[PDB]
Design an enzyme around this catalytic site. Structure first.
Site, PDB file in Angstrom:
ATOM      1  N   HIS A   1      -2.546 108.722 111.214  1.00  0.00           N
ATOM      2  CA  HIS A   1      -1.597 109.868 110.772  1.00  0.00           C
ATOM      3  C   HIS A   1      -1.571 110.543 111.532  1.00  0.00           C
ATOM      4  O   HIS A   1      -0.792 111.902 111.881  1.00  0.00           O
ATOM      5  CB  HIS A   1      -1.018 109.995 109.751  1.00  0.00           C
ATOM      6  CG  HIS A   1      -2.552 110.440 108.601  1.00  0.00           C
ATOM      7  ND1 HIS A   1      -2.264 111.735 109.403  1.00  0.00           N
ATOM      8  CD2 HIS A   1      -2.590 110.623 107.345  1.00  0.00           C
ATOM      9  CE1 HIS A   1      -2.965 112.467 108.130  1.00  0.00           C
ATOM     10  NE2 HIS A   1      -3.216 111.104 106.823  1.00  0.00           N
TER      11      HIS A   1
ATOM     12  N   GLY B   1      -4.333 119.449 105.393  1.00  0.00           N
ATOM     13  CA  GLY B   1      -5.248 119.387 106.413  1.00  0.00           C
ATOM     14  C   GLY B   1      -6.949 119.318 106.461  1.00  0.00           C
ATOM     15  O   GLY B   1      -7.569 118.723 106.755  1.00  0.00           O
TER      16      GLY B   1
ATOM     17  N   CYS C   1      -7.421 116.236 105.827  1.00  0.00           N
ATOM     18  CA  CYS C   1      -7.076 114.700 106.045  1.00  0.00           C
ATOM     19  C   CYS C   1      -8.221 114.232 106.611  1.00  0.00           C
ATOM     20  O   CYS C   1      -8.978 115.619 107.958  1.00  0.00           O
ATOM     21  CB  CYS C   1      -5.879 114.688 107.108  1.00  0.00           C
ATOM     22  SG  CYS C   1      -4.366 114.640 105.439  1.00  0.00           S
TER      23      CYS C   1
HETATM   24  C1  LIG Z   1       1.890 115.469 109.334  1.00  0.00           C
HETATM   25  N1  LIG Z   1       0.494 114.684 108.710  1.00  0.00           N
HETATM   26  C2  LIG Z   1       0.126 114.381 109.569  1.00  0.00           C
HETATM   27  C3  LIG Z   1       0.840 115.097 107.829  1.00  0.00           C
HETATM   28  C4  LIG Z   1       1.387 115.702 106.343  1.00  0.00           C
HETATM   29  C5  LIG Z   1       1.206 115.156 105.811  1.00  0.00           C
HETATM   30  C6  LIG Z   1      -0.251 114.265 104.979  1.00  0.00           C
HETATM   31  N2  LIG Z   1       0.041 114.264 103.307  1.00  0.00           N
HETATM   32  C7  LIG Z   1       1.305 113.184 103.129  1.00  0.00           C
HETATM   33  C8  LIG Z   1       1.007 111.752 102.940  1.00  0.00           C
HETATM   34  C9  LIG Z   1       1.823 110.930 101.663  1.00  0.00           C
HETATM   35  C10 LIG Z   1       1.965 109.538 101.695  1.00  0.00           C
HETATM   36  C11 LIG Z   1       1.154 109.380 102.826  1.00  0.00           C
HETATM   37  C12 LIG Z   1       0.299 110.265 103.995  1.00  0.00           C
HETATM   38 CL1  LIG Z   1      -1.032 109.341 105.012  1.00  0.00          CL
HETATM   39  C13 LIG Z   1       0.227 111.203 103.809  1.00  0.00           C
HETATM   40  C14 LIG Z   1      -0.292 114.420 102.453  1.00  0.00           C
HETATM   41  O1  LIG Z   1      -0.572 114.487 101.431  1.00  0.00           O
HETATM   42  C15 LIG Z   1      -1.481 115.083 103.423  1.00  0.00           C
HETATM   43  C16 LIG Z   1      -2.541 115.777 102.428  1.00  0.00           C
HETATM   44  C17 LIG Z   1      -3.965 115.102 101.879  1.00  0.00           C
HETATM   45  N3  LIG Z   1      -4.631 116.135 101.085  1.00  0.00           N
HETATM   46  C18 LIG Z   1      -4.494 116.543 100.690  1.00  0.00           C
HETATM   47  C19 LIG Z   1      -2.862 117.847 100.418  1.00  0.00           C
HETATM   48  C20 LIG Z   1      -2.279 118.131  99.354  1.00  0.00           C
HETATM   49  C21 LIG Z   1      -1.171 118.505  99.663  1.00  0.00           C
HETATM   50  C22 LIG Z   1      -0.326 118.570 100.960  1.00  0.00           C
HETATM   51  C23 LIG Z   1      -0.886 117.207 101.753  1.00  0.00           C
HETATM   52  C24 LIG Z   1      -1.683 116.772 101.805  1.00  0.00           C
HETATM   53  N4  LIG Z   1      -0.422 113.912 106.190  1.00  0.00           N
HETATM   54  C25 LIG Z   1       0.050 114.055 107.043  1.00  0.00           C
END
Ligand SMILES: CN(C)c1ccc(N(Cc2cccc(Cl)c2)C(=O)Cc2cncc3ccccc23)nc1
Ligand SMILES: CN(C)c1ccc(N(Cc2cccc(Cl)c2)C(=O)Cc2cncc3ccccc23)nc1
Ligand SMILES: [Cl-]
Lengths: 305, 306
Positions: B41, B143, B145
């Site tokens: 992602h 951040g 990830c």
């Molecule tokens: C733009 N970008 C690459 C991006 C943006 C957002 C996210 N998501 C949303 C998402 C929801 C379903 C599936 C997935 Cl895989 C991704 C995430 O959940 C990242 C994330 C990970 N750990 C803790 C977190 C705490 C707060 C906010 C986000 C967090 N992932 C990639």
């Protein structure tokens, strides 16, 4: 989201751990620049520990009696001296992995990471606090002596603890890196006991702020209190007194959540007087006191090293 | 003595953490030999997240679209490929700090250490367990990830988890290092939710044996139970069923303490019925389920405090 008992990354300290052997005794040493620091009881046998005269025991040793192993490499000891309860072994090689470091003496209530070691090899890392009774509730077996406690601020490792002993209640005692014990303990096999411990109030409040930041708010109430009334209540439950310094330190967390420190003190008073009523806070049925206000801010903001 | 939630020393993993950037997205990568592993992602924008077509998004990228930074050094990407939900970036430098390692897929109940990272820089290390619902109760902000989970039994790092997302309940989902998700999760921002979680019974029993080894027996009773009757009671408190495999795995701890596995099950049944009555076990007022039998043997003394 989430809130875990988090330790600092241990890599900078792992590169300093060595094995120190003197006769039949093997323990851990901390190699920084050209000096290896370890507990002075490495020169004792089990009988010596009953009443040791460390200067007399040490004068009988030569540099070659101390075997220092860094990985699979033997370091050569070229000097030795004692500073309080720590033995300093001068070696011919400066540790190329020496990080930027300082020796700091911490206060009760302050937390640090422990890199538990056996035979100069790191085995685990965990977070703990210096209890108000100067012990640490560690997890250590025989051979863990010389394992160290530390904090990291920016790129600098602040070494604050060196493991020396286990008390009869299973809790632990040690020194700062200048060999001064935390607490009224001595490095001798004699009757010693941890004093009655108390709860680190400012840390419980910090953890309550962490719970609020994480969505756990059932314990919040409309009430506030005064520092004096709170301290009367806190004294009744073996909690450490809360000072104006503690309130000042909790200022940022109070501003972020909108709950004043005395507003949170009223929540804590109610929890002490009534319990949790089957509920939990951040997955705990006990009030957690091993996170400082700085630990909460750091974990909730993602500070890196 | 003592019993702590202990993580492996993180140094071997810290030396592998890098920052991966693709456009406006920055996350963490794991650099082993000449390959950097990271969540696929990283090639998505916030809009791309609902129904991303990763094959279509990736074909539009060249090697030089991926910026990989290791410390203050830019690594050069010389190849890229997608394997399941992980992107593998071939780089022109082998990581000189690559430890002895393996990729292992774990089962629910297994524990591991997480080295939480931001911008390729380690922030903290903590111990986790793969919940029976395939989520992990981590501590991760945006951040994080690409941060990884691992074990280091005998100087070899077994990487078992790579962080991808946070679910609406505040729990976390990710993949093994081959990019296969743990659980029925997808790397899409579609409506997804953690299933009802349960307590890891074999781990609670392991921790009760840890409490006996460290000198506490207050919770034991004169009773036993059959495996089936235990499971019929356990399921009523949302505990995972205990299998004959779990009973076999607890054998060494049973031999060290002298307490038969089904006798420790009767103690657990009573703890579930009565609570702790103001008492604690190893400093906890709750039954702890994030220590495996293997973790207890590794941490605890080989000699019980009788
Ligand atoms: C733009 N970008 C690459 C991006 C943006 C957002 C996210 N998501 C949303 C998402 C929801 C379903 C599936 C997935 Cl895989 C991704 C995430 O959940 C990242 C994330 C990970 N750990 C803790 C977190 C705490 C707060 C906010 C986000 C967090 N992932 C990639
Ligand atoms: C061989 N020798 C040098 C030696 C032997 C035993 C010890 N003692 C006893 C002692 C009692 C008064 C004071 C001190 Cl400083 C030391 C320790 O407490 C070491 C220790 C540390 N952590 C966890 C432990 C778990 C089980 C047994 C020991 C542990 N120290 C040195
Ligand atoms: Cl597994």
């Amino acid at each position: 989201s989430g809130f875990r008992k988090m330790a600092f990354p241990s890599g900078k300290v792992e590169g300093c751990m060595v094995q120190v052997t003197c006769g039949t005794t093997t323990l851990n040493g901390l190699w920084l620049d050209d000096v290896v620091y370890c507990p002075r009881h490495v020169i004792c046998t089990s009988e010596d520990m009953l009443n040791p005269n460390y200067e007399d025991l040490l004068i009988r040793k030569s540099n070659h009696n101390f075997l220092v192993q860094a990985g699979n490499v033997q370091l050569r000891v070229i000097g030795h001296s004692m500073q309080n309860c720590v033995l300093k072994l001068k070696v011919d090689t400066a540790n190329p992995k020496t990080p930027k470091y300082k020796f700091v003496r911490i206060q009760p209530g302050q937390t640090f990471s422990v890199l538990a070691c056996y035979n100069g090899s790191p085995s685990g890392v965990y977070q703990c606090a210096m209890r108000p009774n100067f012990t640490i509730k560690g997890s250590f077996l025989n051979g863990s002596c010389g394992s160290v406690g530390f904090n990291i601020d920016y790129d600098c490792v602040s070494f604050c603890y060196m493991h020396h002993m286990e008390l009869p209640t299973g809790v632990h005692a040690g020194t700062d890196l200048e060999g001064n014990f935390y607490g009224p303990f001595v490095d001798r096999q004699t009757a010693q006991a941890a004093g009655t411990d108390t709860t680190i109030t400012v840390n419980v409040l910090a953890w309550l702020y962490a719970a609020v930041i994480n969505g756990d708010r059932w314990f919040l109430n409309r009430f506030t209190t005064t520092l004096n009334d709170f301290n009367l209540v806190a004294m009744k439950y073996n909690y450490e007194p809360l000072t104006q310094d503690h309130v000042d330190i909790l200022g940022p967390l109070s501003a972020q959540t909108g709950i004043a420190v005395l507003d949170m003190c009223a929540s804590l008073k109610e929890l002490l007087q009534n319990g949790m009523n089957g509920r939990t806070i951040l997955g705990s049925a006990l009030l957690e006191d091993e996170f400082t206000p700085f630990d909460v801010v750091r974990q909730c903001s993602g500070v890196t090293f």
